[PDB]
């Protein structure tokens, strides 16, 4: 059947530590090995290590030995991984994969099953509320057939903000760009295109929501 259920995402302060899980199912746990693999955003995957649960022990990529500890709960069928001395360079999605049966040293490994991955975000930044600015049309911009508009959301921590134009309605012609964390701050923006003579009549408002800081801002354009 084979299914691997990884722990939920964690935000954490640098220097700390984190233990993730990988509940295996649909197969006899001790019979197959498990690997932890990380992915930093824009680099490839890289293998952290391997552990066989039915006796025998483990292997490690030598650059991760020290930071990493690979353990097992044969009973609950969970694999764990513990990272130590969390640095921002440890911020990445982490996958546990299962190697096919028979070995490893040379092949017989190859990751035939993957888990959805757990997201480690390492920061030493406390919750900051967003600063919603409204990007309105320029002077001299010679009257289009449609109008692009926006809201600049800046300075927020953590990264889950929600921009919503006309409190759910213009779902089309909307663009929600990647947040780009500058100095502790994440900054993102969003745009909406409405046909000319639909605005500055009919009224357009962007609603920004940052639940960590208990914000609710509405800026009309």
């Amino acid at each position: 059947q084979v299914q691997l259920q990884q722990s939920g995402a964690e935000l954490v302060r640098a220097g700390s530590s984190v233990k993730m899980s990988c509940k295996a199912s649909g197969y006899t746990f001790t019979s197959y090995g498990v690997n932890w693999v990380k992915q930093r955003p824009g680099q490839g995957l890289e293998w952290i290590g391997y552990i066989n649960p039915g006796k025998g022990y483990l292997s490690y990529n030598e650059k991760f030995k020290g930071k990493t500890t690979l353990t097992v709960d044969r009973s609950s069928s969970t694999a764990y991984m513990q990272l130590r001395s969390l640095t921002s360079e440890d911020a990445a999605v982490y996958f546990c994969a299962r190697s096919f049966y028979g070995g490893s040293d040379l092949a017989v490994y190859y990751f035939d099953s993957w888990g959805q991955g757990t997201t480690l975000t390492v920061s030493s930044a406390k919750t900051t509320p967003p600063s919603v600015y409204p990007l309105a049309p320029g002077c001299g911009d010679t009257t289009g057939s449609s109008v692009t508009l926006g809201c600049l959301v800046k300075g927020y921590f953590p990264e889950s903000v929600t921009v919503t134009w006309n409190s759910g309605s213009l779902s089309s012609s909307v663009h929600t760009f990647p947040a780009l964390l500058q100095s502790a701050l994440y900054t993102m923006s969003s745009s909406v295109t409405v046909p000319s003579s639909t605005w500055p009549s009919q009224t357009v408002t962007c609603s920004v929501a940052h639940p960590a800081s208990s914000t609710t801002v509405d800026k009309k354009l």
């Binding site: 690997n35 680099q43 490839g44 995957l45 890289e46 293998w47 292997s59 990529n61 030598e62 996958f95 994969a97 040293d105 040379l106 092949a107 490994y109 190859y110 990751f111 035939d112 993957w114 888990g115 959805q116 991955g117 600063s131 600015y133 409204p134 990007l135 309105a136 049309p137 320029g138 002077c139 001299g140 911009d141 692009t148 926006g150 600049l152 663009h175 929600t176 760009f177 990647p178 780009l180 500058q182 900054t187 993102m188 923006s189 745009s191 295109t193």
Partner: protein, 214 residues
């Protein structure tokens, strides 16, 4: 440590096409090579192992080839579900290593960027500094060039960009370039220009505003 090379970061392809993704190891890995598919925001799955053997359920549109250091992934007839990122991994030496990935995007008709330039807003200015913003929206291809001209001459080292991946609805890219200034840097220079350069135009698409015209 075997250095796996995917010589392409981005590979553009149109549906129904044959596509080949190439991998290269720093040393003869005796055909101990696997290919993994990661879907756009999502999970990884094994396609092919042992150079060319298909993992169960993978459709026969996929095929591995290779010997020694040079390997290939082949997708006969590019379907929609194949827009993903492919990685090759080796399995002879330890650690098990991987290639940087290669992502399939879709080819669509040339699409021209809708750029827009926005002044700093009065509330932000009250809060100390001012950022000008330019949106270059809905363009294909991905190849766009942008610079901010301030009074004829250009300025970078303040500028800060944000692309989206290919849109899932219409196969286009959008982007926001944000200059970010202080209220006095902004109080000098009347013109502020955002300037785009793309395939779909032999003219620079210029979008300016004048600070005292507002």
């Amino acid at each position: 440590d075997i250095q796996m090379t995917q010589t392409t970061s981005s590979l553009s392809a149109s549906l129904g096409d044959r596509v080949t993704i190439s991998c290269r190891a720093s040393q003869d890995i005796s055909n101990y090579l696997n290919w993994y598919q990661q879907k756009p925001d999502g999970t990884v799955k094994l396609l092919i192992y042992y150079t060319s053997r298909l993992h169960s359920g993978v459709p026969s549109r996929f095929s591995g080839s290779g010997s020694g250091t040079d390997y290939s992934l082949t997708i006969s007839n590019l379907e929609h579900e194949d827009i993903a990122t492919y990685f090759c991994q080796q399995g002879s030496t330890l650690p098990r290593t991987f290639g940087g990935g290669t992502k399939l995007e879709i080819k669509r008709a040339d699409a021209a960027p809708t750029v827009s330039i926005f002044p700093p807003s009065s509330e932000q200015l009250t809060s100390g500094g001012a950022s000008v913003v330019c949106f270059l929206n809905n363009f294909y291809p991905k190849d766009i060039n942008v610079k901010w001209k301030i009074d004829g001459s250009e300025r970078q080292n303040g500028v800060l960009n944000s692309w989206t991946d290919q849109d899932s609805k219409d196969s286009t890219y959008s982007m926001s370039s944000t200059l970010t200034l202080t209220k006095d840097e902004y109080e000098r220079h009347n013109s502020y220009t955002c300037e785009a350069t793309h395939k779909t135009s032999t003219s620079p698409i210029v979008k300016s505003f004048n600070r005292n015209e507002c």
